Homo-oligomer: 56 residues x 6
Amino acid sequence: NFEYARRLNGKKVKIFLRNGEVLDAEVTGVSNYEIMVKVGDRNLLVFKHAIDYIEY
Amino acid sequence: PNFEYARRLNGKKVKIFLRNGEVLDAEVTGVSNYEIMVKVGDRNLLVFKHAIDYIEY
Amino acid sequence: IPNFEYARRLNGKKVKIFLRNGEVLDAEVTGVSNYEIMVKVGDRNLLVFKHAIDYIEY
Amino acid sequence: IPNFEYARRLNGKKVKIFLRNGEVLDAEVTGVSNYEIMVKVGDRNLLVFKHAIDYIEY
Amino acid sequence: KVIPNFEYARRLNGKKVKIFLRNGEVLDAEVTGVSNYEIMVKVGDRNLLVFKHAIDYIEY
Amino acid sequence: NFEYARRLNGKKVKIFLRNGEVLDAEVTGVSNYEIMVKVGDRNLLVFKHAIDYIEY
Ligand SMILES: [Cl-]
Ligand code: NA
Ligand code: NA
Ligand code: NA
Ligand code: NA
Ligand code: NA
């Protein structure tokens, strides 16, 4: 049941999305399948399936 | 092992960024484990979550 | 509510299925399982995997 | 998830498998598991993963 | 526990196969192990762990 | 339950991602769905769904 992604809550990370976009993202919440982020003044729900990797 | 944030989007205006590069300016009309129902203008869509990259809300 | 899904509510309806490959199916839905949607497209019978669908207009 | 798949109805049948890579397999189905479809394409035996299939015409 | 139509990939263990990957790469491989989600192979001198989700089909 | 990827913990491997990228990666942790790696001085969380294969 363990996941490392939960430990990224509160960090500001780079999310490398599957299409080539990169989000500079403050992580505000993590669920089994989603990562909630703030990107500047935007709030996003990011699906983990759309992420390739995260630099932190 | 069950909680999801997407359920809280029900009833809200959102921007859905799809894996194909399309962007939907939508109102959410329902959310299930694997689907998000939306209105886009006059159109009614069932959107599979697997086809979504992210949602601005 | 285990296994609630909106897709099976499209059973018996005329829909437009937008596939991940860019194709759009003008379809009549004849069955919906957990992972598949059965459709008629003109004279053709198709088994469509839900994972290959982006969205459905109805 | 109940024990039902429409893909099982295609066992032993001639079908066209439309793959996510754009290929279309003219296939005879020789087995169906939860995640795979076993086929004969000409003289070739293939194990096809369902996740790689967009739809099947039958 | 005896479910014939559960997983065919496990029967590939120890066999020569051609693996067609989702990006168009093709592996001329020998299977050295199979798990629920992975296939272990030798390709030439190289040892690879291949995720099944990255495989389109396998010729055997 | 069993997975081979867990046995790569502590190894330096080449991770071939679905976008065509290769990571020269030291594996520092493995969960059901993630592989934690060091790539040079960068720390990454890599999702297994984004990996095609790993050379080890
Ligand atoms: Cl790909
Ligand atoms: Na969700
Ligand atoms: Na059908
Ligand atoms: Na899969
Ligand atoms: Na790929
Ligand atoms: Na790491």
